[PDB]
Amino acid sequence: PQAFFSHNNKDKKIVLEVLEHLRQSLVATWIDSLIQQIIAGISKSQYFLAFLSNEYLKSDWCWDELEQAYALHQKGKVKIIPILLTNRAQLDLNALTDARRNFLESILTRLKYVEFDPHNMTRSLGSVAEALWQNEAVRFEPIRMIKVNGTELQVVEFKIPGSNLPVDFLHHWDLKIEDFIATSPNEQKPVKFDVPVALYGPGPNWLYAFLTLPFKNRNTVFVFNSRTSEYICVYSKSAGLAPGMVLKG
Amino acid sequence: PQAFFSHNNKDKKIVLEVLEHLRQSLVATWIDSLIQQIIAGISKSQYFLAFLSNEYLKSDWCWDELEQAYALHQKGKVKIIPILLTNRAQLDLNALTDARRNFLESILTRLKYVEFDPHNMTRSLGSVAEALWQNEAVRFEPIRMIKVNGTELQVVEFKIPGSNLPVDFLHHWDLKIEDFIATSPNEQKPVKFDVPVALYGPGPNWLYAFLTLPFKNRNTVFVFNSRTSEYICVYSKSAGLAPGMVLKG
Amino acid sequence: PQAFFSHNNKDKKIVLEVLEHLRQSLVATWIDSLIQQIIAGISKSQYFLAFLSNEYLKSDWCWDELEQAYALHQKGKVKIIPILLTNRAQLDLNALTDARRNFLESILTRLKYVEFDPHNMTRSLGSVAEALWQNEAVRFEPIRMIKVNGTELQVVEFKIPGSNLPVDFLHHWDLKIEDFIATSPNEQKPVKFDVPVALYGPGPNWLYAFLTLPFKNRNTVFVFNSRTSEYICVYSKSAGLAPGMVLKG
Amino acid sequence: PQAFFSHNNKDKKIVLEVLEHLRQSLVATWIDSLIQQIIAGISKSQYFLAFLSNEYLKSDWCWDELEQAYALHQKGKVKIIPILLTNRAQLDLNALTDARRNFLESILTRLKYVEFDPHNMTRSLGSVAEALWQNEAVRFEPIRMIKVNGTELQVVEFKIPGSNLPVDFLHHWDLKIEDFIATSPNEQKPVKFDVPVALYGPGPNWLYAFLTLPFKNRNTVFVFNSRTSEYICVYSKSAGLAPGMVLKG
Amino acid sequence: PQAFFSHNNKDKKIVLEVLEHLRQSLVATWIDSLIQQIIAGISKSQYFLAFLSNEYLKSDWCWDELEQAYALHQKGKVKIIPILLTNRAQLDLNALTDARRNFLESILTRLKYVEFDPHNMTRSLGSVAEALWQNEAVRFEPIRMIKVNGTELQVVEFKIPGSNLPVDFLHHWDLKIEDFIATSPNEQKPVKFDVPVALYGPGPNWLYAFLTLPFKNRNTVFVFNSRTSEYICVYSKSAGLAPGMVLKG
Amino acid sequence: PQAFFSHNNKDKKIVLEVLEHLRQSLVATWIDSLIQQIIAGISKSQYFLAFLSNEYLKSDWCWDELEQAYALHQKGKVKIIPILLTNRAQLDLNALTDARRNFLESILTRLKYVEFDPHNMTRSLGSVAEALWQNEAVRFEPIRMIKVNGTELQVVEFKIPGSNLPVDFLHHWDLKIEDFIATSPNEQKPVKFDVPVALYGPGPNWLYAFLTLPFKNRNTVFVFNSRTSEYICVYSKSAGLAPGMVLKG
Amino acid sequence: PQAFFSHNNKDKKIVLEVLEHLRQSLVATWIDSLIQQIIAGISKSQYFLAFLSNEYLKSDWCWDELEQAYALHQKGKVKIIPILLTNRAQLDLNALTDARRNFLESILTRLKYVEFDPHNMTRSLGSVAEALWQNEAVRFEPIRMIKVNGTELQVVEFKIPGSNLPVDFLHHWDLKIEDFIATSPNEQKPVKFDVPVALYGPGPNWLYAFLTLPFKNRNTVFVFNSRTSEYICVYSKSAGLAPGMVLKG
RNA sequence: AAAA
RNA sequence: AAAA
RNA sequence: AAAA
RNA sequence: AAAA
RNA sequence: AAAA
RNA sequence: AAAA
């Protein structure tokens, strides 16, 4: 899923660290316009993250972007998830005009907001991620660089809410995993270059095949079988990883 | 699994379509010595196909490989199954010498043979394949090309004997699939060039992932889900189809 | 893709160091008219680099060049990328006339701008290059001169956004790699004279063949194979470089 | 791979059309001594084609050439493939002395020979080529002069036994292609003069680059991409052809 | 009826054997322009025979000649019957351009074609003959030589489609018979020189008189009467025969 | 390419050194009328150099020469390259008459000019040469007297913009190398008398053969091969310079 | 390369026509002592042509000449290639003494000979030429006079063995061209007087320059470029043509 | 080809 | 096919 | 997660 | 990046 | 720049 | 300037 970030340069320190966590969760992100990038792809285009702040409300350039984003959001094209860097009590709603104050209160009440505090990074990163996948189909977890039996792996774990998906789910799923694979060790991507990957979590066989297939000539692939709770090697690109090796995970 | 064919030139006509049927079942066939390539690969080398015939045993060139193949069959390196072109009743065991007759009788009784007759090709071909797959892992029925919902498609049907597989089975398997995909339409191969291929049959997630993965950049891949019983598209290498469409049965 | 540079002589110090970085990215640069050079080649003509600055906006000759460039930009022949030498806040908008101020603000709001700061060289150059390639097909990284296994090399890294290209992409691609090869050691060009050139980045076979073909009798060519992740020599022009060694990277 | 032809003048008519077909398979042929030409090049020197016939073994001069060829074949530097112009049944074994008969019988059994019959040209020529390529790296089908979408070109299709090649394969290879390109229309060579050349078959990126590179300033180059199963033009050395046009295969 | 044969020299062997069979059916044939020879005779001009083949469509001379044949075929001057040397599926339609392929497909569907197979000569030749006579008046089976009661004789078998013919049909007929009578024994013609001819088949009185009359001073004439089913001699040019003898069937 | 120099006698000091530098670049220079000499040779006559200066505009003889030169420049016979001795801001257009000032301003604006500064001579000379070659085919660099391995050479280096020339380029190229060879050591010519020359830069073989050919019995000719990046001797007129010696340059 | 002809007067008719063919192939031939002419020039001296015949070996003067030729052939100064006017089968070995017979058999076996026949001149001349060039550098096909586009012209076709030549190859070459240019129309020489000469065949730049240069003031020179495949005129010594005209193939 |  |  |  |  |  |  794509994600457009609206923010001021003052909170630039914290947006990417939030964005990086989202990036590690196989979520497409776009920073730099955004209004015309909304009308692109499928109706499941992106979820707007309005990083509300005292400074952000003081910028007219940043304000009108929220107006156009919300105006077309009523059409159902996009959904907005506003993030409060400061708690609900201390927004400067007095400084803003009556039209702006009414506009902010309408979207703050009828639409759910996510509170953010820099002190507790762990829960805050979970809350934004939870709201991101709350209205979406099968979710993903941030990839974990773990070592099992002396072998380095990056496990890709996904969770299916309700344990049921539409049979034609892949038709409307805009998740192309090739864009998340690093082409070089120094390149920043969710999936490390040449590092073997592992698939985790319950799911139908067609979902596993769909994720496994684009990894040919890119990464060694492991899969998880709950019959023996062990990892199974199905692709051999790295040296020494024969197809069929078992890792007691 | 590899297969080496022992036969005479007179019975050649019977060999090829037997080999052709075996090739369609994803069985590697080597028709044209034979002894030295038996010592190659893994302990699961091949099955010696001795096309026993009334004339086959009348050639001194044809007798020895049966001896050497049997000689190393005692070592367990290979297993031999005899193809009886004619019935056991009218085999001319009188023609052979005493040593040859007893040797032929020793291998015919202690080792199971399979009867073959030109008249009923469908049963005879099935018995030969059964004699091939009886002591093997997950089976492989011949590739059948079917048009479902107006979409042409070929099915790779696999069935597991028993109910479970060793967790490390893929390590010792010798069914690398790259050698069964045609590169040009005119060239013959078990898998047609550019024709979408569907995987059908119950099995573990890793076995499906192992099969579909080498098909990237080669063929459109379909997969069967038993929850609703249609075919699911995972790879789109052909125009007019996308990953996620369904072919109702 | 070629690039046209419209700037004032005071910003000459920053323009060339910007220009050379673009040149190292396999981008054709034309510094020194420009209005008539716009109408040349393919519809993907060039990106107008308007280095807006406080000194830039007080030159009437510089203003009329921008006016015609934007006038044709409405026709879609050439798009403009305005790069700000100074940040928008300190731009001297009061000095200019009403029509010019409205004109400058019109292109500053509807069309995306990129900011430049002398302090942050690395991020400033990357932002300008990113603005160049965002609307472009397969992009190019700046050429890096590295030594692998004691052998001098230069790597031409290219990344394809979306991992998909039109079948007839080479038809409309205005990149002639011959013009970027130095004919003498002292000549300044993206590709060093007689230095081996390595090709890096995933891509189709035709893209690889098209890129390394013009290098015959000019440079020895290396290519990257991700199956074992190390460069392969395919052309031999220098002494001691047989075609076929592997350089572990 | 080099090829030396040992034959008698009576069987000459058969040799040329065998040599011509082998030449079309990008095989270096040397008809007219031979023993000293064996000591040349790499350990993969050549294959000795002994065109055995009833007339051939009556010549003392032809016999010593076979003697020295087999004597140094024991070192493994060259391997011999004996082509039987006549079937083994009516080979005049009584004519030769005891030493010659024992020698000829020794090399016919332990070494694989091929049968040649004047009636079945298509099967005989393929079998001889099959023995040539059976112990070899990537194959080379004879150049096919085809016409697609109104344009005429010669295709060069190659098959890779197995699926993978050694990383340093090109170092030991001896298939310098520039010797197979005709310089004049009347010149008879595997590659026609100025005729477009197409490469077909799945393989690594470096293999394709190594093949198209010597074709600069010689012929236009086409490559086959399996994503859309179409030929792609990379080089345009002739009018009416542009680099990047696509032919529907 | 006249007929022109359009073919290339590669298929010349099959055209002549088709040619002579049509000649025995009393069909005027012209092998070797053809376009201006179309405008000759009566509105029932002739039938065009386009010997389509994979090699036939690769000649521009054949194509342009075919186009003019179809161009004035629309005017109704001539009707074309395309005889396929190879089966329709094996037609190399990819080689032709868009215009040529569309033109060939237009005439293959809207206009009935005839399929030829060299394996089944007798049925293939009849289909060409059947396509020839399907839109024609009274038919003409090939001349057969039958020795009846020890007397050699040739039969000109004719049958009338339907049951009746126009009263003035003879006015527009193009089957003058003096051009099919051999003048010397060595010279080849549908009617043998000096051999008695016989007319067989139901028909009107004038049809028998019209055919019999040109045979005066040329050959002995026999007429078949269905009242008692023998042959009646009406003209005696050979010794030993008189007008009035009967040949019992 | 030819050229006439229009200047006042006060600028004679700087004109000759500019003329000498252009002469070193294989440019035919004519200093001392100029109007009637314009109509001579081919359509690519020359580029007119107007050495504009404050004193130059004060001469009626110089002014009327410029008028006729520009008047016939409109027909396209020759194009004018205006070289400004002083900067544009310092030109004295006030004392100049109205009609001439409009004439001067029309030329300066619609046609590109080159600035001249005696301080930065290296950039000044190159800028004039750049505009001199800017609208021309393959350009020529100033001759460099280089000693390589103790051997004196005068390298003639040429650059081809776009690496492609019309096949009949030599037909309309007005460059005769004979006139640039010094007949005596004291003669002032671009090519030194009896000093060996070298050809540098990529180009077609016929271009090389065209250049070295008129040097027979005049100078020893060296050529540069990029296969080993070494100079090759092809002519031996000087003592001790055999044809074939290699100079590692 | 130089050539010496050792022959008997009875075979003079066949010898001078062999010399004529060799002369046409740019081979300098001296027919009429020879032993002292062996020691002249470079180590690549000349190839001895011993026209062996039944009459030739019956002359003591011819026999002693061959012995000295073979005496210094062991020293490597000159290599001998023998022409068999008659076949080896019916050579009269019984005439020679034991020493002569053994000596002749010594050179017939360890040294490759060329069989010549009166009937098939075309192959016989080619075989003699092939032996001359087999151990040589860049070949030289016989000069052919071909008219292109109404212009008379002669072609000097040369081909390089393998693909590359030593960088200093020109130093040791003994193929000065001025000795093969006719000075008068009646005089016989490989290169006709005043007829334009064309150079054809792939090769390095210096090779073309070395061949082209000595033709100044002698003949018009055409150069073949493979980019577009025509001949390019570089020197104009004949009226009616200029440097730059093209001769379309 | 016996008025073609 | 005995005025088809 | 052994056709979810 | 082993026909993307 | 080894038929640009 | 070695048939300019």
Residue numbers in the entry:
A (entry chain H), B (entry chain G), C (entry chain F), D (entry chain E), E (entry chain Q), F (entry chain B), ...: 2 to 33, 42 to 258
The authors write:
The fundamental repeat unit of this topology is defined by the two-fold symmetric alignment of a pair of TIR-CARF monomers, involving central positioning of the CARF domains and outwards positioning of the TIR domains. Successive stacking of TIR-CARF dimers, anchored in place by bound cA4 positioned between them, results in formation of linear filaments, exhibiting a slight twist, as part of the higher-order filament network. While analyzing the higher-order filament network of cA4-Cat1 complex, we noticed that the dimeric repeat units associate with two adjacent Cat1 dimers forming a surprising trigonal assembly. The inter-repeat unit association is mediated by amino acid backbone interactions between a small loop formed by N158 and G159 residues joining the β1- β2 strands of the CARF domain (designated β1β2-loop) of repeat unit 1 and the N103 and A104 residues present at the TIR domain of the adjacent Cat1 dimer. In this trigonal assembly, the third Cat1 dimer does not pair up with the first Cat1 dimer, but instead it tilts around the center of the dimer (see blue arrow implying a shift below the plane). The tilt causes a shift of the TIR domain, one of which points towards the trigonal assembly, below the plane of repeat units 1 and 2 by 24 Å, thereby forming the helical bundle by bringing it close to the CARF domain β1β2-loop of the Cat1 dimeric unit which initiates the next turn. Three Cat1 dimers are present in each turn of the spiral bundle with an overall diameter of 170 Å and the bundle is closely packed without any pitch (gap between turns).
Cat1 forms dimers that stack upon each other to generate long filaments that are maintained by bound cOA ligands, with stacked TIR domains forming the NAD+ cleavage catalytic sites. Further, Cat1 filaments assemble into unique trigonal and pentagonal networks that enhance NAD+ degradation.
